[PDB]
Design a protein around this ligand. Sequence first.
Ligand SMILES: Nc1ncnc2c1ncn2[C@@H]1O[C@H](COP(=O)(O)OP(=O)(O)O)[C@@H](O)[C@H]1O
Ligand SMILES: Nc1ncnc2c1ncn2[C@@H]1O[C@H](COP(=O)(O)OP(=O)(O)O)[C@@H](O)[C@H]1O
Ligand SMILES: Nc1ncnc2c1ncn2[C@@H]1O[C@H](COP(=O)(O)OP(=O)(O)O)[C@@H](O)[C@H]1O
Ligand SMILES: [Mg+2]
Ligand SMILES: [Mg+2]
Ligand SMILES: [Mg+2]
Lengths: 528, 528, 528
Amino acid sequence: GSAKDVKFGADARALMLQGVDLLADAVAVTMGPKGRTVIIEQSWGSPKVTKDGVTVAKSIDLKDKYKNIGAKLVQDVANNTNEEAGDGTTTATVLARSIAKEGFEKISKGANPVEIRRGVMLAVDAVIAELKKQSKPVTTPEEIAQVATISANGDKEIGNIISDAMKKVGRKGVITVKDGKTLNDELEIIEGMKFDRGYISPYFINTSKGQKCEFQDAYVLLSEKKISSIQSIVPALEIANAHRKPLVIIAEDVDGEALSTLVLNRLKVGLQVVAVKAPGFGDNRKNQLKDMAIATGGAVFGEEGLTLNLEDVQPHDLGKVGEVIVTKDDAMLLKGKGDKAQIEKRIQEIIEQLDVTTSEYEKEKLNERLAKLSDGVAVLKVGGTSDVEVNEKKDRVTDALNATRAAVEEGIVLGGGCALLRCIPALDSLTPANEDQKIGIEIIKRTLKIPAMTIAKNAGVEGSLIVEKIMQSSSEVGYDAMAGDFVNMVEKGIIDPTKVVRTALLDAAGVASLLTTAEVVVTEIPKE
Amino acid sequence: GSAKDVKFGADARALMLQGVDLLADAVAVTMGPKGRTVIIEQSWGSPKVTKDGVTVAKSIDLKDKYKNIGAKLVQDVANNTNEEAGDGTTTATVLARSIAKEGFEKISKGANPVEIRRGVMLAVDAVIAELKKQSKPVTTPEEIAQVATISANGDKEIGNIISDAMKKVGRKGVITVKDGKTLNDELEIIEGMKFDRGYISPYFINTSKGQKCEFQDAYVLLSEKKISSIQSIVPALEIANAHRKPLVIIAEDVDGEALSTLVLNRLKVGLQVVAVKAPGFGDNRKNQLKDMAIATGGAVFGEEGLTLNLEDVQPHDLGKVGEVIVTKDDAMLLKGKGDKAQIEKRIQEIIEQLDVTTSEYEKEKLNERLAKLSDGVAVLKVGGTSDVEVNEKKDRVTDALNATRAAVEEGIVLGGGCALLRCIPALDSLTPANEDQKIGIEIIKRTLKIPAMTIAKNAGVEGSLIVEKIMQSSSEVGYDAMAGDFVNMVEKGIIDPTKVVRTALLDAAGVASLLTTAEVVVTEIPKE
Amino acid sequence: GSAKDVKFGADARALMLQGVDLLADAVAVTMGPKGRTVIIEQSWGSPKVTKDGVTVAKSIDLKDKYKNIGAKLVQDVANNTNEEAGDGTTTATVLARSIAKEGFEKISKGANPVEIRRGVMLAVDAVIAELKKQSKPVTTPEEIAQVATISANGDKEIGNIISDAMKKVGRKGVITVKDGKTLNDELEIIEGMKFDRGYISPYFINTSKGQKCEFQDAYVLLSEKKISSIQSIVPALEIANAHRKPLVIIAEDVDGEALSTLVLNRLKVGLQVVAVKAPGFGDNRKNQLKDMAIATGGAVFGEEGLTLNLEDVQPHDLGKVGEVIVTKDDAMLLKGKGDKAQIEKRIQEIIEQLDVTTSEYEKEKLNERLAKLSDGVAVLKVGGTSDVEVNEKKDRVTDALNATRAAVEEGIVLGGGCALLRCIPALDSLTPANEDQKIGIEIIKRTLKIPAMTIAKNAGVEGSLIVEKIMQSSSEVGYDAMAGDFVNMVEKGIIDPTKVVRTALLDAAGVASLLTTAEVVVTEIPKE
Ligand SMILES: Nc1ncnc2c1ncn2[C@@H]1O[C@H](COP(=O)(O)OP(=O)(O)O)[C@@H](O)[C@H]1O
Ligand SMILES: Nc1ncnc2c1ncn2[C@@H]1O[C@H](COP(=O)(O)OP(=O)(O)O)[C@@H](O)[C@H]1O
Ligand SMILES: Nc1ncnc2c1ncn2[C@@H]1O[C@H](COP(=O)(O)OP(=O)(O)O)[C@@H](O)[C@H]1O
Ligand SMILES: [Mg+2]
Ligand SMILES: [Mg+2]
Ligand SMILES: [Mg+2]
């Protein structure tokens, strides 16, 4: 144990609050429109450029120990808010700073900080209840378009793109974004059962195009194991040639000898066939082959429990699809006739599975299979020209996407902070058990006015003035910063998710209130 | 041997006392309500936040050698108190500091410190005897609820939860806490014989649910060895299919070949079976499978001494239970018909075992088997939102739990330090052998007033005033700090364990009195 | 995470702008004629000497962190411009600096930088549209000659050489430059099917010259596999000797035993034969052998798909060419009679391939095969007497080549910056959505006058004067710096690619406008 150092009372309080104020002034700019980006130095390549408040937050590290403690207690709020709701980081940080500063003023010699924490918790409960009461669900895609248009920092193309994605894939589809290439954004819909793996032999190339193999109404072979012996591969090709239709071979791997047979019958007379390996790592590829068989209609081969030997295959034992396309690094199955009721039951199985089980990575490929079997997958290849532009725009896009998915399931509320200001009468409605909880109530009451204050600040206007004049106005009337005036939000097209707001408020309030009761700080000696 | 340094008399005394005063001022706040947390810097992640006095104590390390010696002699008191009674750390630290300070004033050139130690020991004996005489056992669960409500730092939910745990599991049940997930705490009762291990083949999945296998009134197979040959596994399945009932296979491990037979008969016609490995890791499994067999009623297979070959099994040789459920990571046995007198005798065996043998880890799994066979196991999944909130609340909960278990077996006393103040007349009843023992007696007499003094200090009130006015009052009347006034404690619902008080007092008195006789200190030179 | 440092507002802005001004003053000289070279210190040898703006750019690294950030944001613009269009680096850097400086003046407390970025983007769109409208395609080789003559920094020999290369190879041929060896430049045309590998045995040397093997109308043998057994090699030589014509053996490798047979029949009776291995790669060598077979006219041997054993070869199964010559390190095939329609279809295959697929190293060897089959690649040896002169002249030549290839496909425009000045009325034609976009528009409007200003500066003349007097003049009239006066450019023979201009402008505008919105900079502490 390294020799440590201790500090008491107002000293440690002032140092920690200074550190938190440093970290929070670093970030509080990036709220709403008129916020301003932040450049961080990447140690190896180009620096990062952001508006996000966790890259900003998680990047900051302070030399002094106590200020470092402040920075850590802010970054934990940021990180929890991120991992819980994805967006609402800046709000978390600013509310945390305000709550901490208010806490480090009522710390008397007669006050009991734990009661302060309790009262803060009561306030948070009351305000979150008032939020959920004043929420409202999302129904029309106009609301989705609006929310997405917001969370790109006021970009409308992002809103339209996410709207079209959620419409052509469904409100619980699987959309994902990749680093775009061209100057502009792109919304691609990977439809059908498609996956990253190309035709093994470049002799199946019947496309007269960029390395494609195109079949129509072809049969399918689905082996969990490899295909080594000629005796194994031969009867399948026999049945295919008897029917005189193209054949796909989705299996673990193709022997060079059966491959030689294939290429022999392909170069000359030309038995329409094609060879492709399995989809993925271990068990996941097994389940995916099962799903592929049940989708196309047929039966997986190479089983353990029944094992379905290839020697005895049958014309109703093959996978059948309308069209198949293969490119050197991926293939697509289109019209698998797989007993739509049966695939429905499969879907119900895997959906109850995801409902019960999840690990944030299990459920990832879970929904992967769901979307790959039911309705496409949306990719969002973005514009941009520099890597830093790419990172910026992609960050904003992903943030908007997470906000939209949070808003689709749980209700929305009037944007621009108006919800909390409307919830303040709830705080006026509480009755504290004693003085200390009332102190905490007044702390949260002051805190609720903080965010719109910060926003008006960023706009370059009078914070408290705008906050008061908003509180005087109606329930739905509030302040736009872009138009710099008062309007109805939903009329104007500004709303926000309820889940993001509630999670951010809860995280910030909890961590800051816990921080307040600190009395004595111990730190490592500054040796090295 | 590194070159060292020596110091004599008042110098070394003052340095060690300065170090101990640093370490004890660091902690003395965290007593009773109105105590205040401490933030410690974790070297790698988020800082810790505490009220406990050993994290605080064990964290502190001083640059200067002599102050380091003081810190070590305080941390040893803290650590002994923890490992002995679990709670009573802060009290140990404060009493140790007060005893040390009183000791480093009577150190004359004519005084004999060893006699001082002797007198202190006599005082401690008298006071602990007076404690145990004025103790009183715990009878009703209201006392348990009260005590738990205290030791969450005045939280009532913790009290109610621990009370319900001890009621639904018994005053010597096995309750344990894990890092909760949701916003709120949770009291879960793992009942029956349940253990962390999932069904091997995901073909036994008859639940139509999140990866469950549910059987009712199924037979059991219990092998200490693996199940490789088809000849070995076959007769069991024969008997099960003859009776036409589901079967569980609890064994070391299942061959892929017998597994293939199982999956064959399961996918088609569907002999109700299920495969699960052995719960215990090592010899613990060698006992646990025996216990499982005797619980369900049957006989373990794969024995060494009789070895019970699987080829000749019998319908009365199987484990029989009412219901069985298996997840992907654990399963539960419910209604094992295992000769309740016989399981009783087994329980008596293992309980006499724990009574005789223990290693703090042997006896752990010992009570594990006891509770798993007799009445459930209580888990206490906690609330919280941040990792630091989790650590804080879990620490307080575990402390309350340890205090409750200490109080259930050995008597309780009036809380808020009143017991020692009531025991002071015992010190007024002693007769010293000579002057020095009388000096030690007066030392302990002053010491006994220290804690309530510190508590009133934390409250923000006059220490000696409150101590005196309490001493003037009745035996059961004392001071609440939350109501900041005088009440009857047991009337008010404040009590404490006698074991915690006695152990803390004994540890602090012993180590501090030993410290007092120090005359000359030697330290490592400060090279590196 | 190392302890970091933060800076706000005007401070970080001033530091980053100082760094960018350092890096841009380092480079801005090297534009047009009268630009001046830059010497960089190579850490292990002779230093580099350049006019390029990415050796200068990528070399510069600043001690101070913030200035380093400025340098990185400039080098990224330079590198993107390079990797996109190859030339137009200096223009990118200077436009970036001007845009950055203009940005770090309108940064008020009321201004919204994101709107500034938006307006800049609108300006860039308008200007690029006006460029493409005022472009014009390249038709006559005079234009190519002029462009190349420019981009060697006004060298005419470079222009003539690149013109002759593109004429004798076609506007989409494959020209490449290598480090010359003589005093002067040299344009070599590798025609026929030639590749780096020499005759294995130096007994086939019938040239009476510097290690050559010359055959006329010889047969060809093409094995994908080695040639080990005498039985394998013997029938080919049998057929060749029956026809009584020389034979080439292009295969994986020659056995020492078949080699012994060859040398036996060579030193004695004098069979005409020659042995050469494959090109030597992986799949690329197999494709090249296939193309060689289809070029000469014949069947590749050692195939996997269709075996084509050497034992049964046929007089129409051999590769046939007009003339073959072999060195010790490369050989050339001439007049391969390979079914010109068939080779045409092959060309169409590989060209659709390149049209669809590319990886910047796949399409490289792709065009390699295209040219090697249809038009001999043009190499450019550079004549210089110092290694540093070699690097300088070669850099300028490669830049001129890249500029020419960019200009051949996409249109050209009047050189010497006149295009942007002519596009400024487009900026006068826009209507901003609000004030901020108008600010950005005026930013770009000022920016467009920057480059010609810098050029007149380098010339030693009055920048703004020349810019204004050009703007007063006609559309096609502008300023030469070499003649230091006004002329018509296309009349005078100055033009430039539209792609270079558009890409440079776009990159610089994008990255600089993104940089403008920075508000807070975070850097690593300067520890080490
Ligand atoms: N035009 C707008 N006018 C008024 N308020 C807005 C506007 N756009 C966004 N906001 C508000 O600002 C917030 C966006 O700030 P943001 O960058 O997302 O910080 P965080 O990452 O913590 O969510 C939204 O919650 C919204 O209420
Ligand atoms: N409401 C209360 N009013 C008066 N005394 C209390 C109250 N709650 C706890 N105490 C007293 O304070 C002590 C709790 O201090 P504690 O945090 O447990 O320090 P330690 O870890 O050394 O036990 C109890 O022994 C009790 O006598
Ligand atoms: N003799 C010339 N007279 C007028 N303008 C010229 C002349 N030569 C080049 N230029 C102009 O200057 C530019 C050449 O600068 P350059 O060295 O190519 O910088 P960069 O590498 O960024 O392209 C050309 O785009 C051209 O418009
Ligand atoms: Mg946000
Ligand atoms: Mg305690
Ligand atoms: Mg150039």
